[PDB]
Design a binder for these strands. Structure first.
Ligand SMILES: [Mg+2]
Ligand SMILES: [Mg+2]
Ligand SMILES: [Mg+2]
Ligand SMILES: [Mg+2]
Ligand SMILES: [Mg+2]
Ligand SMILES: [Mg+2]
Ligand SMILES: [Mg+2]
Ligand SMILES: [Mg+2]
Ligand SMILES: [Mg+2]
Ligand SMILES: [Mg+2]
Ligand SMILES: [Mg+2]
Ligand SMILES: [Mg+2]
Ligand SMILES: [Mg+2]
Ligand SMILES: [Mg+2]
Ligand SMILES: [Mg+2]
Ligand SMILES: [Mg+2]
Ligand SMILES: [Mg+2]
Ligand SMILES: [Mg+2]
Ligand SMILES: [Mg+2]
Ligand SMILES: [Mg+2]
Ligand SMILES: [Mg+2]
Ligand SMILES: [Mg+2]
Ligand SMILES: [Mg+2]
Ligand SMILES: [Mg+2]
Ligand SMILES: [Mg+2]
Ligand SMILES: [Mg+2]
Ligand SMILES: [Mg+2]
Ligand SMILES: [Mg+2]
Ligand SMILES: [Mg+2]
Ligand SMILES: [Mg+2]
Ligand SMILES: [Mg+2]
Ligand SMILES: [Mg+2]
Ligand SMILES: [Mg+2]
Ligand SMILES: [Mg+2]
Ligand SMILES: [Mg+2]
Ligand SMILES: [Mg+2]
Ligand SMILES: [Mg+2]
Ligand SMILES: [Mg+2]
Ligand SMILES: [Mg+2]
Ligand SMILES: [Mg+2]
Ligand SMILES: [Mg+2]
Ligand SMILES: [Mg+2]
Ligand SMILES: [Mg+2]
Ligand SMILES: [Mg+2]
Ligand SMILES: [Mg+2]
Ligand SMILES: [Mg+2]
Ligand SMILES: [Mg+2]
Ligand SMILES: [Mg+2]
Ligand SMILES: [Mg+2]
Ligand SMILES: [Mg+2]
Ligand SMILES: [Mg+2]
Ligand SMILES: [Mg+2]
Ligand SMILES: [Mg+2]
Ligand SMILES: [Mg+2]
Ligand SMILES: [Mg+2]
Ligand SMILES: [Mg+2]
Ligand SMILES: [Mg+2]
Ligand SMILES: [Mg+2]
Ligand SMILES: [Mg+2]
Ligand SMILES: [Mg+2]
Ligand SMILES: [Mg+2]
Ligand SMILES: [Mg+2]
Ligand SMILES: [Mg+2]
Ligand SMILES: [Mg+2]
Ligand SMILES: [Mg+2]
Ligand SMILES: [Mg+2]
Ligand SMILES: [Mg+2]
Ligand SMILES: [Mg+2]
Ligand SMILES: [Mg+2]
Ligand SMILES: [Mg+2]
Ligand SMILES: [Mg+2]
Ligand SMILES: [Mg+2]
Ligand SMILES: [Mg+2]
Ligand SMILES: [Mg+2]
Ligand SMILES: [Mg+2]
Ligand SMILES: [Mg+2]
Ligand SMILES: [Mg+2]
Ligand SMILES: [Mg+2]
Ligand SMILES: [Mg+2]
Ligand SMILES: [Mg+2]
Ligand SMILES: [Mg+2]
Ligand SMILES: [Mg+2]
Ligand SMILES: [Mg+2]
Ligand SMILES: [Mg+2]
Ligand SMILES: [Mg+2]
Ligand SMILES: [Mg+2]
Ligand SMILES: [Mg+2]
Ligand SMILES: [Mg+2]
Ligand SMILES: [Mg+2]
Ligand SMILES: [Mg+2]
Ligand SMILES: [Mg+2]
Ligand SMILES: [Mg+2]
Ligand SMILES: [Mg+2]
Ligand SMILES: [Mg+2]
Ligand SMILES: [Mg+2]
Ligand SMILES: [Mg+2]
Ligand SMILES: [Mg+2]
Ligand SMILES: [Mg+2]
Ligand SMILES: [Mg+2]
Ligand SMILES: [Mg+2]
Ligand SMILES: [Mg+2]
Ligand SMILES: [Mg+2]
Ligand SMILES: [Mg+2]
Ligand SMILES: [Mg+2]
Ligand SMILES: [Mg+2]
Ligand SMILES: [Mg+2]
Ligand SMILES: [Mg+2]
Ligand SMILES: [Mg+2]
Ligand SMILES: [Mg+2]
Ligand SMILES: [Mg+2]
Ligand SMILES: [Mg+2]
Ligand SMILES: [Mg+2]
Ligand SMILES: [Mg+2]
Ligand SMILES: [Mg+2]
Ligand SMILES: [Mg+2]
Ligand SMILES: [Mg+2]
Ligand SMILES: [Mg+2]
Ligand SMILES: [Mg+2]
Ligand SMILES: [Mg+2]
Ligand SMILES: [Mg+2]
Ligand SMILES: [Mg+2]
Ligand SMILES: [Mg+2]
Ligand SMILES: [Mg+2]
Ligand SMILES: [Mg+2]
Ligand SMILES: [Mg+2]
Ligand SMILES: [Mg+2]
Ligand SMILES: [Mg+2]
Ligand SMILES: [Mg+2]
Ligand SMILES: [Mg+2]
Length: 204
RNA sequence: CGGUAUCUAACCAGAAAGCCACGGCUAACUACGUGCCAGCAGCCGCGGUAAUACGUAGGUGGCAAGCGUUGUCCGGAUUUAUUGGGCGUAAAGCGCGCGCAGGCGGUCUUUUAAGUCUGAUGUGAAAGCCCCCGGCUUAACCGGGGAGGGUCAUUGGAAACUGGAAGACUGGAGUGCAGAAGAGGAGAGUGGAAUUCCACGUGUAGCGGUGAAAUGCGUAGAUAUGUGGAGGAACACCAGUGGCGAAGGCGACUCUCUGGUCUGUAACUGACGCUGAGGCGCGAAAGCGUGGGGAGCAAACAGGAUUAGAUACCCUGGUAGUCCACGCCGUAAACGAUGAGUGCUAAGUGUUAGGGGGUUUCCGCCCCUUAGUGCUGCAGCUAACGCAUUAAGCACUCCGCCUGGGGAGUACGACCGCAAGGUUGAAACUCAAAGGAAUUGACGGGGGCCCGCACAAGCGGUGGAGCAUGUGGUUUAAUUCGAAGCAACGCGAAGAACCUUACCAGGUCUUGACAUCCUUUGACCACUCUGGAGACAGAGCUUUCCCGGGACAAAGUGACAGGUGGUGCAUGGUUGUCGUCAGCUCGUGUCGUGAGAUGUUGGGUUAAGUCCCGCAACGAGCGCAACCCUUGAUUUUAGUUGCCAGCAUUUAGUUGGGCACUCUAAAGUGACUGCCGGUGCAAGCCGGAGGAAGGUGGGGAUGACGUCAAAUCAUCAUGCCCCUUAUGACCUGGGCUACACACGUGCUACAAUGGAUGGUACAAAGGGUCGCGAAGCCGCGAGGUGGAGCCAAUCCCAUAAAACCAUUCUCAGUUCGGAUUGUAGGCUGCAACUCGCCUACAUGAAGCCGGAAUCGCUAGUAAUCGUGGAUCAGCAUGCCACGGUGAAUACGU
RNA sequence: GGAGGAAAAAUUCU
């Protein structure tokens, strides 16, 4: 049986959209400009541990917020990387772009970051069990109420693919006021392609 | 021996270290090379791209002038068990009995010293092991003394025990006396029920058989029924984990001849007993020889069926045999898978054959005891299942047997048999397992309970006809690819004339239609005309980067690009299905040698692992339920584009005016078996009140652990494998729409609850700026023209249709039905032939309610009538939503 | 729960 995307089940219920702008007659072009912005930002700040990007619009003016774990790489020594990004985004959109940076405290409590971590260990040939268990350990000692991870694919370069999952605490997926974060990332292996799924049930 | 041992002086760190191993057993790891190859190996086994096991290098461990390998012996091995094992199910109790030799043997007394125990004498050479002393500079080595070692000969002692002799006694054993029961065995005779065959009356067309049939018997007269006769085998009810026997085994009745057992007495003898190799005898069934008998059944055999085949199971027949007498054979899951004898060790409860006592007039009931036969259970034993006074417990005597699986109960030899074969019984070789009990799952062509529009009760359909659409098949240059029981088939496709397009024909291109960098130029593109089906070529006007940067831009060249090419069985991601089915586990305790178990089993109740009551468990978590959306009632806040009541106005809720009422949308309230009666220990169940609403009120979203190598390399991404002047790229035309046929899903009808004509009411939810498109005018109509109001609670789409009211038709293949075809037109589009949709006039096919069969649905549901939307220039009977009218039935598993 | 007797149904394959 299939499950519904836990984030999709909570958009508008207890969660919020990542694109907080309203438009009519200029909706498709705004949407695809936002998609291009997101892709270009994701391809530039790859190794900066970026957790979330949100975009807003108001009268020929694009505001971008980048929730990231370590702002020192994003916000440079005095504004080198930020201004390079802003100029490139200006040339990409032909608008006026203002870039705002915030820092994620307790970065082990965010699902995308831990999924990136597990994918990075798996790409570096670290046993899947070790990576999953250690990520669970750190996430739980960071103050979570529940963690669940699974890794699926040609595990260890075998001929037949399978999936293995581990958990600690509780993750109630059917409760609507439960605030589960969720992330899926791919690891690029010489044997194929591996998938890492992470559910984090926080206090809310 | 011999200038030998030994000793004295000078020089010298200089002339002197190797082997095996490093994953576990077992002490000691890193890198490189290789890639199921090279190879290692005592075993577990390592080698397929990250090798502490292969080779090497570094390091480490053990030993040392030695270190490894092989061969033989002992240990570990309790794996021949005297010390020191066993035989219910793992290998291991002869099928049973009678018994020679042998082994063992109740109690007491006297006597003997054969066994037993002990003292003395002689001897058990030297060397060797051992103890104490010594000698070589130590040690090895050597010497001295001592000790050890015998079922040893002579001889002296003791007499508890085993043995011998002489006596004595009954508990063992047997006889006597009195009763009891029994399918114990052999011989002869007899009885009834039933089957088969034969003869004769009545009677006519089938009988028999199977999952279905057929072979077969029958009109030459069956099957059926009544009467009589012949012959053979087996003994219904009684009948019972009842009885007898050593075992095999023994069921009708009567008689004759015979074996064994139990209880009662204490009369009699006085250990006369147990076991028992070799011998002798009995021994289910099948089989053999001779002679009878032969009704049923039935190996072999034949025919009919089933099956792909059917040397079988099933059906119709049928010979040996089953029966009797005599003689062989000597086997079995011959089993309680448990050898015989003796004694000891909690209880409860049936039954068979006896004995004693108490109650009681008898009957009967109660207690005690002997010998059998069942069940439940304590200690104890067992790996566990389990056994447990009928031991698999505790002990002793005697016999038989076992030592990893296969080869094999086989070969050679021997004995027995008429034969079939029986008894005794190996080895080479090969494997590292074979096996017993129990546990958690997964299956079964095993079972029980419970639920679901699964069946039942109903309503409407499908299968019949015409058309629309998908699939198979066939055809074709191509008819592009994918989906294949349920879970493929109005499916991907929420729009195939061109494009989409991946397919085919013909015409063209090669760093390229699409990306980064390179080298020169920097704005190239757009436009006109000529040729061409078009892609493309040929001339002119031509290209205006900005501030060396950058993205664009033309030329030439690579590095490269480009694949809807294959593998969904190498994958990520997404989905179907069981199924919104009710499950999946954990913590702490207890029970088990252990893996494990309990909670989670049992009885009720629920939609539900929902809850209650029990119970060695007490709780919790993910799944159920709740939180989210919508609908039904209502309060406050807010009145425009919504509403109009009381007021003036108008073709008009129009204009003025007002939020009263509907309405709109934010926040609350409200339903919880909350209260009442009954029932129940409780959960719960049946009714009642109030309330808009009553039993999770109606409906959504929500899909746990797992199943199907399920679907998708063609949405995307991706390992590996393929093409690269082509499997890439551009164009015009065609095809995906073919048509003897079969299937799936739908639409329209077969008419009077109806057709035609006229009149006339009542919705909801949605869409609209390169868009919706009003009024008016023109047209028979599809439509044209016109341009108002709208970025919308305002304007437009927008006529709702069934329903209702009048007139007509009057049961007719028709004034039903609309396919099919002829002509003339309308729109969109460059273009409507293949191949769009719509209109007018003409034409007027099948079709009379649909066979075997099959589908949906439990209430605002089914049935029926319209409306809107996505895709979309145009195109839906499909899909997704909206309202109008609005049922029947559910006894039950 | 244990022991004894005992009916009726029955196609082939995966
Ligand atoms: Mg599902
Ligand atoms: Mg999802
Ligand atoms: Mg998910
Ligand atoms: Mg997967
Ligand atoms: Mg000399
Ligand atoms: Mg000398
Ligand atoms: Mg000198
Ligand atoms: Mg010198
Ligand atoms: Mg020297
Ligand atoms: Mg020196
Ligand atoms: Mg030296
Ligand atoms: Mg040396
Ligand atoms: Mg090595
Ligand atoms: Mg070395
Ligand atoms: Mg060394
Ligand atoms: Mg030994
Ligand atoms: Mg043994
Ligand atoms: Mg024994
Ligand atoms: Mg055995
Ligand atoms: Mg026996
Ligand atoms: Mg035997
Ligand atoms: Mg015997
Ligand atoms: Mg004897
Ligand atoms: Mg004696
Ligand atoms: Mg000596
Ligand atoms: Mg000597
Ligand atoms: Mg000395
Ligand atoms: Mg010596
Ligand atoms: Mg000596
Ligand atoms: Mg001596
Ligand atoms: Mg000694
Ligand atoms: Mg004496
Ligand atoms: Mg006696
Ligand atoms: Mg007759
Ligand atoms: Mg006497
Ligand atoms: Mg014998
Ligand atoms: Mg016989
Ligand atoms: Mg005979
Ligand atoms: Mg037969
Ligand atoms: Mg035998
Ligand atoms: Mg036996
Ligand atoms: Mg015994
Ligand atoms: Mg008894
Ligand atoms: Mg018992
Ligand atoms: Mg035993
Ligand atoms: Mg086994
Ligand atoms: Mg089992
Ligand atoms: Mg189960
Ligand atoms: Mg079953
Ligand atoms: Mg069902
Ligand atoms: Mg039903
Ligand atoms: Mg149904
Ligand atoms: Mg029915
Ligand atoms: Mg019907
Ligand atoms: Mg129907
Ligand atoms: Mg219908
Ligand atoms: Mg049909
Ligand atoms: Mg048909
Ligand atoms: Mg038809
Ligand atoms: Mg039809
Ligand atoms: Mg039609
Ligand atoms: Mg159609
Ligand atoms: Mg076809
Ligand atoms: Mg052809
Ligand atoms: Mg072809
Ligand atoms: Mg096809
Ligand atoms: Mg495919
Ligand atoms: Mg379904
Ligand atoms: Mg289907
Ligand atoms: Mg359908
Ligand atoms: Mg089609
Ligand atoms: Mg074309
Ligand atoms: Mg490629
Ligand atoms: Mg492959
Ligand atoms: Mg495939
Ligand atoms: Mg896959
Ligand atoms: Mg699959
Ligand atoms: Mg496949
Ligand atoms: Mg898959
Ligand atoms: Mg396959
Ligand atoms: Mg299931
Ligand atoms: Mg299950
Ligand atoms: Mg369970
Ligand atoms: Mg149980
Ligand atoms: Mg629960
Ligand atoms: Mg729920
Ligand atoms: Mg309302
Ligand atoms: Mg009520
Ligand atoms: Mg609800
Ligand atoms: Mg497959
Ligand atoms: Mg399937
Ligand atoms: Mg399939
Ligand atoms: Mg396939
Ligand atoms: Mg590919
Ligand atoms: Mg792809
Ligand atoms: Mg596909
Ligand atoms: Mg494909
Ligand atoms: Mg596609
Ligand atoms: Mg339909
Ligand atoms: Mg219809
Ligand atoms: Mg008509
Ligand atoms: Mg009318
Ligand atoms: Mg109306
Ligand atoms: Mg409306
Ligand atoms: Mg529209
Ligand atoms: Mg309309
Ligand atoms: Mg309308
Ligand atoms: Mg007609
Ligand atoms: Mg026509
Ligand atoms: Mg046409
Ligand atoms: Mg056309
Ligand atoms: Mg006409
Ligand atoms: Mg005609
Ligand atoms: Mg006709
Ligand atoms: Mg008629
Ligand atoms: Mg049905
Ligand atoms: Mg229902
Ligand atoms: Mg309808
Ligand atoms: Mg109609
Ligand atoms: Mg309609
Ligand atoms: Mg309709
Ligand atoms: Mg409509
Ligand atoms: Mg429509
Ligand atoms: Mg349209
Ligand atoms: Mg339709
Ligand atoms: Mg149409
Ligand atoms: Mg319809
Ligand atoms: Mg029902
Ligand atoms: Mg029974």
């Amino acid at each position: 049986g299939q499950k519904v995307h836990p984030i999709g089940m909570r958009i508008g219920v207890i969660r919020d959209w990542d694109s907080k702008w309203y438009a009519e007659k200029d909706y498709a072009d705004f949407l695809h400009e936002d998609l291009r912005i997101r892709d270009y930002v994701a391809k530039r700040l790859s190794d900066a541990s970026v957790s979330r990007v949100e975009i807003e619009r108001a009268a020929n003016r694009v505001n971008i917020t980048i929730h990231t774990a370590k702002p020192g790489m994003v916000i440079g020594k005095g504004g080198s990387e930020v201004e390079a990004l802003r100029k490139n985004l200006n040339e990409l959109t032909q608008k006026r772009v203002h870039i705002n940076i915030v820092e994620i405290k307790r970065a082990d409590l965010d699902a995308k970051l831990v999924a990136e971590n597990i994918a990075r260990q798996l790409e570096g040939r670290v046993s899947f069990r070790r990576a999953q268990k250690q990520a669970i350990q750190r996430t739980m000692r960071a103050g979570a109420k529940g963690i669940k991870t699974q890794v699926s694919g040609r595990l260890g370069g075998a001929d037949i693919a399978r999936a293995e999952h581990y958990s600690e605490g509780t993750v109630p997926l059917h409760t609507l006021r439960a605030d589960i974060d969720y992330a899926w990332e791919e690891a690029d292996t010489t044997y194929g392609k591996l998938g890492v799924k992470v559910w984090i049930y926080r206090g809310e």
